[PDB]
């Protein structure tokens, strides 16, 4: 149960990197909770924003 971002040393999540973000959403495309993905709280927020800015820009779906 390790954080992706702490692990790989990633300090900035980018809403344009869709193929990363897709690791953290469900197949429906709901965001996955932090207790499932191992993510740090710190990153979960960042991640949460990114995905939201993605979704606005139709890079991810709101609902698959």
């Amino acid at each position: 149960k390790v954080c992706y971002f702490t692990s790989n040393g990633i300090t900035h999540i980018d809403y344009k990197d869709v193929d990363l973000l897709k690791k953290f959403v469900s197949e429906r495309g709901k965001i996955l909770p932090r207790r499932v993905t191992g993510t740090n709280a710190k990153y979960q927020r960042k991640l949460t924003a990114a995905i939201k800015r993605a979704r606005q820009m139709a890079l991810l779906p709101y609902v698959s």
Partner: protein
């Protein structure tokens, strides 16, 4: 309307009719218009109302009256009720109340009358007649009353104590585990009577626990005298005459890779990289068909066994230990006879050229699976230096494996990677530790090589068009898979395909998505419970779970009778050239009866192995009553939920320990939901449990929930 109803009833009254769904009835009647389809549905409703047809709970229509019944096998329970498993597996189970069993026992083929009224969700029924009696022996614990004995059956599905008349005692004392042969069955209120056939010993003596398992399934004991005479007469070294017409390979670099504790080395391998970039793979299997000839003592016994069995403490072999650990064994640095499968394999893992032939080998080194992992994965410099001449081949094996694995998975083979237990005992048979059995790189390498050799042998003989034995795995049950597909849409996994025409790759798509999720273990486990078991047959029907069209077992004839036959058919058809009509008719008669038997001897090995494991897990947990462990809800039922630990030990949380709320089971979600609290325990949640009780005899571990 009435003429259509008659026509449907007459169609269903044909002798060849099996119970069909509405869609199957639509297809069989060639109904193509939407209005004729409405006519069928109204007819099926009207006939079902009249009681002239019956809808089973698997949504299949059958004429009761030809039955008013269903033929099937009893699956008894320990509380006194049962289920009918129909012969037509597409039909649903029929619940049988304890009063309506009418002397039926577990495994009995019966006929059951269908009750018009059901008191619950499932269709009820009464046993009217017993066609075939399954149980003829019963193991148990003997007990001595004043003027008569009884025996308490270890199979708790036998709810009633077996009466022993005083002349049937045969020396059995209080607390002795005993075999008992049935003289009579239960009748009305009278129990089954018997006679003690065998005394095992006392129930507190070490090893009687397992021995009781061995007797419960009816597993083979010691070898017959004529087999042990044949085994004792078999030479311990190869005769020079046997080297005739065998390809000498003694100078090549060949190695066995097995477990550290394995003495029955079936397989030895080699990998040479060719100049074009393709790989040459030699698979060299122990030539058991030479030393165990057709219709010798050992052969008759090895047919009666069907397989070796691998219980916790001991191995019940298929063939004698003198043969299986001596001359057939591909022991290190000694001349051994083999039947080889040598394969040229290109840069996409396709076999371009193959040859199956008789050989003699001399194995360069006996490796282990732990040593081979240390050389490849851990990069261990001491072990490399020790095995310096083999290190280049071990890296050439690794790359070939990967190429064969990448092919397999692209063809759509289902990798069902689950955690299995290995129990560790002492010399007495008492349990030391339950650890995870990890599939490393060295095992998966050997796995892939064996697979391709088994694939290459099968394919060669299918095109030959001679009678042969195949290892088949049919398509899974369409109803069971329909229920599996539903279950995964709850977690959000959306599959492409229907339950009657799934390609294996679609199931692999699920198993890749769930990888490293909490849901994994259970969706994994629930898919499994939609799969059919693999069996042997004489027909090539393909293997679903390897997604191949041609497969047999060739690579272990020490410990599988079907493999030993594959070695005889190879010697018959390829080496000897006996492809005459009389040879073919002989084997074409015999293989359906071997295939059916050996299949049933495998399922009797598995059931028994598992039953020793579950016993020794339970033996493990007796000193852990009170202790708190993290786990994961493996299953949820109307009576509770099962929890798996991180050493794979399973235990129940009974609803009666869920004291914080009145829990209702939701069948669709797979969950226990509280009415008041709104707490929801689901399949796949992580929970902490405490050990409450452990019953070794029953093989029960009871848990209580400390927290989520």
């Amino acid at each position: 309307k009435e003429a259509f109803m008659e026509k449907l009833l007459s169609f269903m009254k044909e002798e060849a009719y099996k119970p069909l769904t509405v869609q199957e009835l639509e297809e069989m009647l060639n109904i193509t218009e939407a209005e004729e389809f409405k006519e069928l549905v109204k007819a099926l409703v009207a006939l079902e109302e009249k009681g002239l047809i019956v809808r089973t709970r698997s949504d299949r229509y059958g004429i009761p009256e030809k039955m008013n019944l269903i033929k099937g096998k009893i699956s008894a329970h320990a509380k006194g009720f049962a289920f009918l498993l129909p012969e037509d597996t597409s039909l649903s189970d029929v619940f049988i109340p304890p009063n309506e069993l009418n002397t039926a026992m577990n495994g009995d083929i019966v006929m059951v009358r269908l009750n018009s009224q059901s008191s619950g969700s499932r269709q009820e029924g009464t046993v009217i007649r017993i066609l075939e009696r399954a149980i003829q022996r019963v193991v148990g614990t003997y007990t001595e009353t004043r003027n008569f004995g009884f025996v308490i059956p270890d199979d708790k599905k036998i709810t009633s104590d077996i009466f022993i008349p005083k002349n049937g005692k045969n020396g059995a004392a209080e607390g002795h585990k005993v075999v008992v042969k049935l003289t009579s069955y239960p009748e009305g209120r009278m129990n089954a009577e018997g006679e003690v056939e065998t005394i095992l010993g006392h129930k507190n003596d070490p090893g009687i626990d397992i021995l009781s398992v061995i007797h419960k399934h009816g597993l083979p004991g010691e070898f017959p005298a004529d087999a042990m005479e044949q085994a004792s007469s078999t030479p311990d070294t190869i005769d020079e005459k046997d080297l005739k017409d065998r390809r000498d390979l003694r100078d090549q670099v060949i190695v066995t890779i097995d477990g550290a504790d394995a003495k029955d080395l079936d397989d030895a391998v080699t990998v040479t990289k060719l100049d074009d970039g393709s790989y040459k793979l030699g698979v060299h299997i122990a030539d058991v068909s030479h030393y165990v000839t057709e219709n010798s003592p050992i052969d008759k016994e090895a047919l009666e066994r069907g397989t070796s069995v691998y219980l916790v403490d001991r191995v019940i072999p298929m063939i004698p230990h003198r043969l299986s650990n001596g001359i057939c064994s591909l022991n290190p640095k000694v001349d051994r006879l083999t039947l080889s499968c040598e394969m040229t394999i290109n840069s996409q893992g396709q076999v371009t050229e193959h040859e199956i032939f008789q050989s003699v080998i001399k194995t360069t080194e006996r490796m282990t699976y732990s040593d081979v992992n240390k050389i490849l994965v851990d990069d261990d410099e001491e072990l490399k230096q020790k095995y310096e001449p083999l290190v280049p081949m071990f890296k050439d094996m690794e790359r070939l494996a990967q190429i064969l694995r990448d092919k397999r998975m692209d063809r759509g083979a289902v990798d069902f990677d689950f955690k299995e237990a290995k129990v560790l005992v002492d010399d007495e048979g008492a349990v030391k530790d339950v650890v995870i059995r990890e599939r490393s790189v060295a095992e998966k390498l050997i796995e892939e090589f064996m697979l391709v050799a088994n694939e290459t042998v099968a394919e060669h003989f299918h095109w030959m068009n001679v009678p042969f034995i195949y290892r088949i795995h049919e398509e899974p049950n369409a109803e069971k898979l329909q229920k599996f597909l539903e279950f995964v849409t709850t977690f959000g996994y959306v599959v492409k395909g229907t339950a009657g025409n799934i390609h294996p790759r679609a199931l692999q798509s699920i198993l890749d998505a769930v990888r490293d999720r909490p849901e994994e273990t259970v969706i994994s486990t629930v898919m499994l419970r939609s799969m059919k078991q693999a069996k042997y047959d004489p027909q090539s029907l393909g293997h679903f779970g390897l997604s191949t069209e041609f497969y047999t077992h060739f690579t272990s004839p020490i410990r599988r009778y079907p493999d030993l036959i594959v070695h005889r058919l190879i010697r018959t058809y390829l080496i000897n050239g006996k492809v005459d009509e009389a040879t073919q008719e002989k084997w074409a008669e015999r293989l359906p009866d071997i295939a059916e038997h050996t299949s049933s001897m495998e399922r009797r090995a598995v059931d028994a192995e598992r039953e020793t494991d579950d016993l020794k897990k339970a033996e493990y947990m007796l000193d852990k009553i009170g202790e708190e462990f993290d786990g994961m809800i493996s299953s949820v039922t109307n009576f509770g939920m099962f929890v798996e630990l991180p050493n794979t030990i399973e235990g129940l949380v009974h609803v009666s320990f869920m004291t914080d709320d009145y829990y209702r089971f939701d069948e669709q979600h797979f969950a226990m939901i509280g009415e008041r609290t709104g707490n929801v325990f689901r399949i796949g949640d992580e929970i902490t449990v405490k050990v409450v009780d452990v019953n070794k005899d029953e093989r029960n571990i009871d848990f209580e929930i400390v927290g989520m």
